Write a protein that binds this ligand. Structure first.
Ligand SMILES: *[C@@H]1O[C@H](CO)[C@@H](O[C@@H]2O[C@H](CO)[C@@H](O[C@@H]3O[C@H](CO[C@H]4O[C@H](CO)[C@@H](O)[C@H](O)[C@@H]4O)[C@@H](O)[C@H](O[C@H]4O[C@H](CO)[C@@H](O)[C@H](O)[C@@H]4O[C@@H]4O[C@H](CO)[C@@H](O)[C@H](O)[C@H]4NC(C)=O)[C@@H]3O)[C@H](O)[C@H]2NC(C)=O)[C@H](O)[C@H]1NC(C)=O
Ligand SMILES: *[C@@H]1O[C@H](CO[C@@H]2O[C@@H](C)[C@@H](O)[C@@H](O)[C@@H]2O)[C@@H](O[C@@H]2O[C@H](CO)[C@@H](O[C@@H]3O[C@H](CO[C@H]4O[C@H](CO)[C@@H](O)[C@H](O)[C@@H]4O)[C@@H](O)[C@H](O[C@H]4O[C@H](CO)[C@@H](O)[C@H](O)[C@@H]4O)[C@@H]3O)[C@H](O)[C@H]2NC(C)=O)[C@H](O)[C@H]1NC(C)=O
Ligand SMILES: *[C@@H]1O[C@H](CO[C@@H]2O[C@@H](C)[C@@H](O)[C@@H](O)[C@@H]2O)[C@@H](O[C@@H]2O[C@H](CO)[C@@H](O[C@@H]3O[C@H](CO)[C@@H](O)[C@H](O[C@H]4O[C@H](CO)[C@@H](O)[C@H](O)[C@@H]4O)[C@@H]3O)[C@H](O)[C@H]2NC(C)=O)[C@H](O)[C@H]1NC(C)=O
Ligand SMILES: Nc1ncnc2c1ncn2[C@@H]1O[C@H](COP(=O)(O)OP(=O)(O)OP(=O)(O)O)[C@@H](O)[C@H]1O
Ligand SMILES: *[C@@H]1O[C@H](CO)[C@@H](O[C@@H]2O[C@H](CO)[C@@H](O)[C@H](O)[C@H]2NC(C)=O)[C@H](O)[C@H]1NC(C)=O
Ligand SMILES: CC(C)CCC[C@@H](C)[C@H]1CC[C@H]2[C@@H]3CC=C4C[C@@H](O)CC[C@]4(C)[C@H]3CC[C@]12C
Ligand SMILES: CC(C)CCC[C@@H](C)[C@H]1CC[C@H]2[C@@H]3CC=C4C[C@@H](O)CC[C@]4(C)[C@H]3CC[C@]12C
Ligand SMILES: CC(C)CCC[C@@H](C)[C@H]1CC[C@H]2[C@@H]3CC=C4C[C@@H](O)CC[C@]4(C)[C@H]3CC[C@]12C
Ligand SMILES: [K+]
Ligand SMILES: [K+]
Ligand SMILES: [K+]
Lengths: 993, 294
């Protein structure tokens, strides 16, 4: 993959002839290649598909998951276990096999964690591969003189390939014959400009000539033929894809957060380890003892169960989102929504309901209102002028929608119509006050039609005229009122015709602004009678060249339609403004209407004003006012087509309420790329392929689900199933909610680390019998604490989350020093003291007073001293004192659970009190009950002294940790109180997580 | 980063805070930890109060007494050369440490020692476990009772010519009365002869059936010449109520020991309140691996 040969500017053989290219590829211009030759080349050059580059093999990524942070520590633990076993096997006879078992188990834990994480990512990958749901396609190749549609991967260099408006160019071709063919080079030129492909050559630059079709583009209109010059990774899109794909995606915020704490945890782990190992040999400890130490310290510091807890937590919230109509493709997108501060949404189908009914109509310099009520209980619109008849003919003819078969029973408004909502609303209005449209349509046969174009912005067609005395041709066209206004010279007034003097042009501008201010969408309709002398009844007007006069048409009148808004839309806009999310109305609707919809939805807050509004309120020119006195602004699409980068940066940097109208969804991407540049997370809402480059580069791409296409949804990160806008807010809220719970659970899990670390430290400084073994630790972090930490996710909100500003990534984190000061500094200390208390109590009741325990370790561990004098003078054998030490481990573990009760209760809420929030979380209650039942089972079950080394406890011991637990509860309760009374004080900037 | 987060000169910050932040945090932690320490100390003082000084509340983990010996074996093995003197020094040193506590000079006067029956006798109760009567009195145990293993004649105790000794001892338990097996038709073979009720018998043998032949003459020395412990040295009233108390001892000479070969000798005591354990190899019995390689 030579990058320099790929960095060079593309070269080609375009400047050639049709004869010079077939020889180069061995083909026929009228017969193409032969099947045998085609297969010979298919085997010579390879398939026409992106050759698999550095891909991750199944075993490679599985082996990768086996080596990562916690697994390396557990690996060194297994290694240490086998080292201690080897030492025992070579130094002593009858070596117990406890260490070999512990090592095999650690290795199993490492292998299984892997398996689980891999299974989850595989599940997501499968649901990710299941998105292409309609039907694939192929290319049209001509071999041996016959047309065949074969798998695109089977296309080779030299055969003949035919394309048709709507199909994708399967490879790089050399056009040989075209028929009004146009391509959309949006992938190389960055513009939605319909470039025409002609067989002739026109520019020295291959990207500018027309005799070459390029992979990754589509033929918008027309048909063409061509020879295949490039296929596979060699096509244009091939050099774009193979070298730009190598580019890494990145590391989502939650990943960076998980790394930051693995770094801190490892810091304290190595600090305690290397130091106590040097200390062990500075005090005369042998090698088989120091190895056991090292192991115990590594296990004590590492939270063997955290990461899996996080992975579960996140899976639970993903199921909740799949239940609230918002589906998330990538697990981490769950949090990206909360950290969002800029949204680029659309108006049709999100803020509005998309159901739609015609509302107002313009004709004979007079605004007319139509009945827009379900049961049709209102006022008619004076159906007595000829203008209205002509309007009915224009709308009823220049429309492709038709009622769905079998609706002869339902009413005219509630029936199903197959088509767009505009053509449907027009069809319903015509069928309402003009009778059966099916006969109105068969009464005028459509000869030639040119459908709506995103570029032409108009729909035209020439039908026959039902006139029995006028055997001429009728032409009708509808479209944007400005474009249609620019294409006329006469006005049908009360039936007769008149010129288009500026008087009616201004009346049309005021009428357009009137219907726009009403929040309605307006369309213009015009028609013209083609002279039968220049276009006889036999002449066929093929849709190829200018066969119809685009200008000099007869404008009849405007037609609006009331798509209404949604229930939560005003509330959603208010919620966004309250949080601080900059909303930007990007809509293909009209600014004249956009200003009305803006005032109606909230984008333009009641009080803000635009420069034109100020110039109108002060009846002065617009060039005099200062742009700083205008809070909002309406940016037109054409002025967007002619705008530089820095200008856009300043536009987004100086305005709080921007609205983009007459915008082609291409420009959208430009606005998105301008929003990310300033330093804010960006989300986007799309429906088609023009949004693909915008959803991919946005921090989070929200694609519609019902109306969206496979491409748009498969390329986005979050999919909506109801196409509503409130779902975006719900997604952000859930992203915050699952964050505060992670903080609580982390503090929980961490707090119990101190009571596990302190026994070992006192074991080395004070020389007392080991208080907490390693198996007991693993039984604490992997057992009793898992369920409570999992339950901490089901906690509801405390205050209003949808009201605070987004968290800063460079300053606010997930694990700061405040939490360390709480878990490692205060709560954990009390828990450790309680454990030591129960310890000393157990030893004092059996005969070993606290004064005689300091210094006994050397003999307490001596396996050959069968006479250890206690505080009373009794002689204790080795196994008897070991049994007592194990019972002390059991009681220490139970003390840990007792203090964990109050820790889980003080961790339930971070600020609020328990008597306010409430114990409505059933999972937490179940966690406490199970946490206690497990400890009792592990101690009282017979045969637990052979497996886990845990002896039964006497009913009076179980009450040695209770005072510490209640004290922890009271301390945290008073803590969460000064914060509420003193906002911004010491307790807040010191202990408020 | 590296340098700034360590010391900046504009905000006069060290590690991140100023002198007043570091001071507020240090003062808070000092008060917090001080309260923690005071509470732990109070909860430990109440613990010093809740127990009795003359008796352990729980005595179930030490019900079946153990059986220890005088030599200190690393792996319950006694291996030494009859030529190299620096081979059995670790044994004699221990043996001596144990017997050095039965010196007659230590046992002198009426207080607190009392002369007891030179022949095994019955129990002796010096009252209850109280402080009413002063320090109780314990019976005297003379060194000389052990005849050939006393370190008074042959300091080495035997190890010098291939005839080592092994001083066995019963683990001291408060209020424990040793009870021997009765004369009924059911009794081990060995125990039949010399059934002094007042003596707790101790008898050693070979772990395996083969080793029998390779083990010679087990000669036991004790109070009255019997191979046991006299019941008169019980019970034990505890350190607080009976300081300067001596527990009986039993010497065992393994005469006629085969040379250059590992011999497994298991010693065992017999009695009612005596029970062995398959897990603890020192509960009532004990094992020794003697090998006099010369
Ligand atoms: C257990 O521990 C004891 C030590 O406490 C240990 O050995 C006993 O040690 C003492 C003193 O060392 C022995 O007592 C006497 O030993 C005399 C030996 O000294 C003579 O020889 C040396 C040099 O060879 C001279 O310097 C010295 O001047 C002496 O001449 C011995 O002479 C004593 O008298 C015995 O012998 C005379 C005849 O010579 C006899 O008339 C006495 O009646 C007496 O008994 C007889 O001994 C012989 C010896 O084999 C015996 O065959 C005969 O049957 C005896 N006659 C009887 C019984 O009527 C006096 O013995 C003492 O004997 C040592 N052993 C014993 C068993 O008493 C033991 O070895 C340790 N035992 C074990 C199993 O570990
Ligand atoms: C309990 O009794 C122990 C033995 O008591 C002896 O016998 C009893 C029956 C009485 O007669 C009593 O009066 C006896 O003392 C007693 O231990 C003994 O303590 C003394 C004093 O330290 C030791 O004497 C010293 O001996 C060494 C060499 O010892 C060799 O033999 C022993 C084994 O016996 C080995 O362990 C050694 O390594 C040696 O191989 C002499 O070098 C040393 O010299 C000192 O004295 C001379 C004058 O004699 C001076 O010129 C020097 O400068 C030195 O100051 C002593 O002679 C005796 O060895 C030791 N016996 C044993 C068996 O260890 C013990 O202390 C008593 N304990 C209590 C609590 O009462
Ligand atoms: C503990 O127990 C033993 C054995 O007791 C015996 O067995 C028990 C299981 C139970 O059934 C007892 O009732 C039963 O006696 C005691 O030792 C035994 O003592 C007797 C009496 O001396 C011995 O019997 C003797 O056997 C000799 C040959 O083996 C024989 O020659 C003896 O003759 C004597 O008695 C006859 C009358 O029968 C008389 O004419 C003679 O002149 C002479 O006195 C006598 O029959 C047993 O052998 C002894 N058993 C053993 C194993 O040695 C033992 O004394 C007792 N200890 C205590 C402290 O009570
Ligand atoms: N099917 C249609 N046939 C004819 N005219 C249409 C049709 N759909 C939309 N129009 C008109 O052309 C304009 C361009 O539509 P476009 O899809 O770009 O945006 P939009 O429907 O207004 O929605 P959005 O808010 O998502 O941009 C519409 O505002 C409407 O005036
Ligand atoms: C001590 O053991 C020895 C054997 O090591 C016994 O003496 C042997 O007796 C046999 C006859 O049974 C003779 O053939 C050997 O020559 C003897 N060997 C020696 C070294 O004497 C001896 O009887 C045993 N003595 C005791 C008291 O057990
Ligand atoms: C075994 C005993 C004697 C060790 C006692 C160690 C104590 C004093 C240590 C353990 C953890 C430490 C605290 C942990 C976290 C922080 C937050 C940081 O931003 C400033 C330091 C500060 C405030 C530390 C101060 C000293 C501290 C409380
Ligand atoms: C409100 C606060 C200060 C009250 C704290 C009370 C403390 C001092 C109480 C609560 C529980 C008590 C201990 C609980 C259990 C045992 C075991 C029993 O076999 C003897 C008493 C003993 C050893 C108690 C001693 C005193 C103790 C620690
Ligand atoms: C509410 C909290 C902070 C109060 C804690 C009070 C602490 C500091 C008090 C409670 C009990 C007190 C101890 C209890 C017993 C003794 C033994 C006595 O012979 C001297 C005083 C001494 C050594 C006390 C020292 C101070 C002490 C530990
Ligand atoms: K841990
Ligand atoms: K994206
Ligand atoms: K933990």
């Amino acid at each position: 993959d030579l990058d320099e040969l790929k960095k060079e500017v593309s070269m080609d053989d375009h400047k050639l002839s049709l004869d010079e290219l077939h020889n180069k590829y061995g083909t026929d211009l009228t017969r193409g290649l032969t099947n045998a030759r085609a297969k010979e080349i298919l085997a010579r050059d390879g398939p026409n598909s992106l050759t698999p580059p550095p891909t991750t093999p199944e075993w490679i990524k599985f082996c990768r998951q086996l080596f990562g942070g916690f697994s390396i520590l557990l690996w060194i633990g297994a290694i240490l276990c086998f080292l201690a076993y080897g030492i025992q096997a070579a130094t002593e006879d009858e070596p117990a096999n406890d260490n070999l078992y512990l090592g095999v188990v650690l290795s199993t834990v490492v292998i299984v964690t892997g398996c689980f994480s891999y299974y989850q990512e595989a599940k997501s990958s499968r649901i990710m591969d299941s998105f292409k749901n309609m039907v694939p396609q192929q290319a049209l190749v001509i071999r041996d003189g016959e047309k065949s549609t074969i798998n695109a991967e089977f296309v080779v260099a030299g055969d003949l390939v035919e394309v048709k408006g709507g199909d994708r160019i399967p490879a790089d071709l050399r056009i040989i014959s075209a028929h009004g063919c146009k391509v959309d080079n949006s992938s190389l030129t960055g513009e939605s400009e319909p470039q025409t492909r002609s067989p002739e050559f026109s520019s020295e630059n291959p990207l500018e000539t027309r005799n070459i079709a390029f992979f990754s583009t589509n033929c918008v209109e027309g048909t063409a033929r061509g020879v295949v010059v490039y296929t596979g990774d060699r096509t244009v899109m091939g050099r774009i894809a193979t070298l730009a794909s190598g580019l890494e995606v990145g590391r989502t915020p939650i990943a960076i957060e998980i790394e930051h704490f693995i770094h801190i945890i490892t810091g304290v782990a190595v600090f305690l380890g290397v130091s106590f190992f040097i200390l062990s040999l500075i005090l005369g400890y042998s090698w088989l003892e120091a190895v056991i130490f090292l192991i115990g310290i590594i296990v004590a510091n590492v939270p063997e169960g955290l990461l899996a807890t996080v992975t579960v937590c996140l899976t639970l919230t993903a199921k909740r989102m799949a239940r609230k109509n918002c589906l998330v493709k990538n697990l981490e997108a769950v949090e990206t929504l909360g950290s969002t501060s800029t949204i680029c949404s659309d108006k049709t189908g999100t803020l509005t309901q998309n159901r739609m009914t015609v509302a107002h109509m313009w004709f004979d310099n007079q605004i007319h209102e139509a009945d827009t009520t379900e049961n049709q209980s209102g006022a008619a619109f004076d159906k007595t002028s000829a203008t209205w008849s002509a309007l009915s003919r224009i709308a009823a003819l220049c429309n492709r929608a038709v009622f769905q078969a079998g609706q002869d029973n339902v009413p005219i408004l509630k029936r199903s119509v197959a088509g767009d909502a505009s053509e449907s609303a027009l069809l319903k209005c015509i069928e309402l006050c003009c009778g059966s449209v099916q006969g109105m349509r068969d009464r005028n046969p459509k000869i030639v039609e040119i459908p709506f174009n995103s570029t032409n912005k108009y729909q035209l067609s020439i039908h026959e005229n039902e006139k029995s005395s006028e055997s001429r041709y009728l032409l009708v066209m509808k479209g944007a009122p400005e474009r249609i206004l620019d294409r006329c010279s006469t006005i049908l007034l009360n039936g007769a015709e008149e010129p288009l003097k500026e008087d009616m042009k201004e009346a049309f501008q005021n009428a357009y602004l009137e219907l726009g201010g009403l929040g309605e969408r307006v369309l213009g309709f015009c028609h013209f009678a083609l002279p039968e002398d220049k276009y006889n009844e036999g002449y066929p007007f093929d849709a190829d060249e200018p066969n119809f006069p685009t200008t000099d048409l007869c404008f009849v009148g405007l037609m609006a339609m009331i798509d209404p808004p949604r229930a939560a839309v005003p509330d959603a806009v208010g919620k966004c403004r309250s949080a601080g999310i900059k909303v930007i109305m990007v809509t293909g609707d009209h600014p004249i209407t956009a200003k009305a919809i803006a005032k109606g939805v909230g984008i333009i807050s009641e009080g803000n004003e635009t420069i034109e509004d100020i110039a109108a309120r002060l009846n002065i020119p617009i060039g005099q006012v200062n742009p700083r006195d205008a809070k909002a602004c309406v940016v037109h699409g054409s002025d967007l087509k002619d705008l530089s980068t820095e200008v856009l940066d300043d536009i987004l940097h100086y305005h709080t309420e921007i609205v983009f109208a007459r915008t082609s969804p291409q420009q959208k991407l430009i606005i998105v790329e301008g929003c990310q540049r300033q330093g804010a997370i960006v989300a986007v809402t799309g429906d088609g392929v023009n949004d693909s480059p915008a959803l991919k580069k946005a921090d989070i791409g929200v694609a519609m689900g019902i109306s969206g296409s496979d491409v748009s949804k498969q390329a986005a990160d979050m999919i909506l199933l109801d196409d509503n806008f409130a779902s975006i807010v719900t997604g952000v809220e859930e992203g915050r909610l699952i964050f505060d719970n992670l903080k609580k659970s982390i503090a929980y899990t961490l707090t119990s680390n101190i009571p596990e670390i302190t026994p070992f430290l006192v074991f080395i400084i004070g020389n007392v019998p080991l208080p907490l073994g390693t198996v007991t630790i693993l039984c604490i972090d992997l057992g009793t604490d898992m369920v409570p930490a999992i339950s901490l996710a089901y906690e509801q909100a405390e205050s209003d989350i949808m009201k605070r500003q987004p968290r800063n990534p460079k300053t606010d984190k997930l694990v700061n020093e405040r939490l360390i000061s709480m878990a490692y500094g205060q709560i954990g200390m009390i828990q450790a003291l309680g454990g030591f208390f129960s310890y000393f109590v157990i030893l004092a009741e059996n005969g070993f007073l606290p004064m005689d325990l300091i210094g006994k370790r050397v003999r307490w561990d001596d396996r050959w001293i069968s006479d250890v004098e206690d505080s009373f003078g009794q002689q204790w054998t080795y196994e008897q004192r070991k049994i007592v030490e194990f019972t002390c481990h059991t009681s220490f573990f139970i003390s840990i659970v007792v203090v964990q009760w109050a820790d889980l209760i003080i961790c339930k809420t971070r600020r609020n009190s328990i008597f306010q929030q409430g114990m409505k979380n059933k999972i937490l209650i179940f966690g406490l009950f199970e946490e206690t039942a497990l400890a009792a089972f592990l101690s009282y079950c017979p045969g637990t002294d052979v497996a886990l080394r845990m002896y039964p406890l006497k009913p009076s011991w179980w009450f040695c940790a209770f005072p510490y637990s209640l004290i922890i509860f009271l301390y945290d309760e008073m803590r969460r109180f000064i914060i509420r009374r003193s906002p911004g004080g010491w307790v807040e900037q010191e202990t408020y997580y | 980063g590296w340098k700034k987060f360590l010391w900046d000169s504009e905000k006069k910050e060290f590690l991140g805070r100023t002198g007043s932040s570091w001071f507020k945090i240090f003062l808070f932690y000092l008060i917090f930890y001080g309260c923690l320490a005071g509470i732990f100390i109070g909860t430990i003082q109440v613990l010093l109060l809740t127990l009795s000084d003359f008796e352990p509340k729980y005595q179930d983990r030490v019900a079946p007494p153990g059986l220890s010996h005088a030599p200190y074996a690393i792996k319950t093995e006694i291996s030494f050369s009859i030529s190299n003197p620096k081979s059995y020094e670790s044994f004699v040193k221990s043996m001596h440490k144990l017997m050095d506590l039965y010196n007659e000079s230590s046992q002198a006067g009426n207080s607190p020692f009392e002369d007891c029956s030179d022949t095994p006798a019955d129990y002796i109760k010096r009252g209850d476990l109280d402080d009413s009567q002063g320090q109780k009195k314990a019976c005297r145990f003379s060194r000389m009772w052990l005849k050939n293993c006393s370190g008074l004649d042959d300091t080495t105790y035997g190890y010098a010519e291939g005839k080592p000794c092994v001083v066995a001892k019963l683990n001291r338990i408060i209020g424990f009365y040793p009870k021997p097996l009765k004369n009924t038709t059911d009794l081990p073979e060995e125990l039949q002869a010399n059934y002094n009720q007042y003596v707790l018998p101790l008898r050693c043998a070979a772990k395996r059936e083969e080793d029998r032949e390779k083990i010679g003459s087990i000669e036991y020395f004790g109070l009255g010449g019997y191979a046991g412990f006299p019941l008169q040295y019980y019970p034990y009233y505890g350190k607080r109520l009976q300081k300067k108390y001596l527990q009986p001892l039993l010497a065992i000479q393994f005469t006629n020991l085969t040379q250059n070969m590992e011999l497994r000798i298991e010693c065992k005591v017999y009695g009612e309140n005596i029970d062995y354990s398959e897990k603890d190899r020192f509960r009532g019995r004990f094992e020794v691996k003697i090998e006099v390689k010369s």
